[PDB]
């Protein structure tokens, strides 16, 4: 059974099966809280592994005590069920330990992918007025903002979503879809804000050029 659980992580044989991971995001005040929560997924994976182990553990103990009579019942762990064999494992505790380690590794991989997703949390976090104040109306600032928006759009090529995180298949599909929508929205908002800034700059430049041309037309330089 330890080998079988290890295979599941990776007539006596058997074959277990498990569902996929609950991959998702959230909209909590536009805050992406993954659906299901990462802690919930880890607990559910623990529950599934516990069910796989309880498949073996549910074996009743050797009920030879029915010949005996007189004393009160003694359905202990190994007495009623199969319990002491957990200590009496011939391969040693390495099987269950490796199962726990593999669970930890899968959870770490989930955490890494989740950090990768949550790297866009600042997309919701964007304080646009502060961003405009920090960038300023510098024409080089506007050009760099346009280039940076183009690069950010270029770093958001989303075709496939549901990144199956092993046996807990991460349902990154809808989360990535909402994320692509949010990235398009951020790009469009940046386009609008840069449009406002560039329109102000173009209006100021046109006003200055018109003032210079009017000064030249009214007062000729060769007067």
């Amino acid at each position: 059974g330890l080998r079988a659980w290890t295979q599941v992580l990776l007539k006596p044989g058997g074959e277990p099966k498990i569902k996929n991971v609950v991959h998702e995001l959230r909209i909590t005040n536009q805050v992406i809280y993954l659906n299901p929560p990462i802690e919930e997924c880890r607990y559910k994976l623990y529950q599934e592994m516990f069910a796989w182990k309880m498949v073996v553990l549910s074996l009743p103990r050797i009920q030879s005590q029915r010949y005996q009579v007189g004393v009160h019942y003694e359905l202990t762990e190994e007495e009623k069920f199969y319990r002491n064999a957990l200590t009496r494992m011939p391969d040693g505790p390495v099987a269950l330990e490796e199962s726990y380690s593999a669970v930890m590794g899968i959870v770490s991989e989930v955490e890494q992918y989740v950090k990768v997703w949550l790297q866009y949390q600042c997309l919701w976090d964007m304080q646009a007025e502060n961003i405009y104040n920090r960038l300023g109306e510098d024409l080089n600032k506007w050009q760099a903002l346009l280039v940076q928006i183009r690069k950010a759009r270029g770093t958001f090529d989303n075709a496939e979503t549901k990144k199956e995180f092993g046996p807990v298949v991460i349902d990154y599909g809808k989360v990535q879809s909402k994320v692509n929508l949010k990235y398009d929205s951020w790009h469009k908002e940046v386009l609008s804000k840069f449009g406002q800034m560039l329109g102000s700059n173009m209006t100021e430049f046109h006003s200055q050029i018109s003032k210079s041309r009017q000064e030249l037309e009214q007062h000729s330089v060769d007067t």
Binding site: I131, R134, L135, K141, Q143, A144, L145, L146, V147, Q148, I149, R150, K151, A152
Partner: peptide
């Protein structure tokens, strides 16, 4: 380049 540097600096 510097535009990506500015965007990532933001």
């Amino acid at each position: 380049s510097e535009e990506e540097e500015g965007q990532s600096l933001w």
